[PDB]
Amino acid sequence: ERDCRVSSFRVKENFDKARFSGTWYAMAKKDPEGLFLQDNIVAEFSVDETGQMSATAKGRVRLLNNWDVCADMVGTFTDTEDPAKFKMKYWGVASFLQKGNDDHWIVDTDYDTYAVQYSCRLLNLDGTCADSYSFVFSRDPNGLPPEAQKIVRQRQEELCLARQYRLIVHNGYC
């Protein structure tokens, strides 16, 4: 129907790390294989004086087959040629928590309302993503306003993920 090659995906022009800092509530998520963050996902972004963006996140994570738990995650982002595309090294405060390094793209954001993040962990041989995940963030835990919601829907479709998200709830579980 459209172009689903990851290399074709537009990301936030002149992404501004500073303006992006602060609390972002995950309102929806498209899970990758072996999903980790389950719900009640709240991210806290920061940028140090060197311009290096980093983040922490708290939320219900699924450790084992049948049950989950509340966990604190940490992430440091390494810049790339594209201001909106990063390499995110992450780990949990708990040594045994999932550790890794995923691409982290800020697909779109208006900084004070919504943010659409995307990560393709593995490309298919045709350039489309084989294993991806994406978070739609809101500055307000109560959700995005209609205008932002509509923009996010468009963004989700551009990522070829619009039918693959699930809502993230925030019920003080953690």
UniProtKB/Swiss-Prot annotation:
Recorded consequence of changing A55T: In MCOPCB10; dramatic reduction in retinol binding; has greater affinity for the STRA6 receptor
Record InterPro entries: Calycin (IPR012674), Lipocalin_ApoD (IPR022271), Lipocalin_CS (IPR022272), Lipocln_cytosolic_FA-bd_dom (IPR000566), Retinol-bd/Purpurin (IPR002449)
Omega-N-methylarginine carried by residues: R121
Disulfide bonds: C4-C160, C70-C174, C120-C129
GO BP: cardiac muscle tissue development; detection of light stimulus involved in visual perception; embryonic organ morphogenesis; embryonic retina morphogenesis in camera-type eye; embryonic skeletal system development; eye development; female genitalia morphogenesis; gluconeogenesis
MF annotations from Gene Ontology: molecular carrier activity; protein-containing complex binding; retinal binding; retinol binding; retinol transmembrane transporter activity
Linked pathology: Retinal dystrophy, iris coloboma, and comedogenic acne syndrome: A disease characterized by retinal degeneration, ocular colobomas involving both the anterior and posterior segment, impaired night vision and loss of visual acuity. Additional characteristic features include developmental abnormalities and severe acne. Microphthalmia/Coloboma 10: A disorder of eye formation, ranging from small size of a single eye to complete bilateral absence of ocular tissues. Ocular abnormalities like opacities of the cornea and lens, scaring of the retina and choroid, and other abnormalities may also be present. Ocular colobomas are a set of malformations resulting from abnormal morphogenesis of the optic cup and stalk, and the fusion of the fetal fissure (optic fissure).
This protein's name: Retinol-binding protein 4
Organism: Homo sapiens
This protein's encoding gene: RBP4
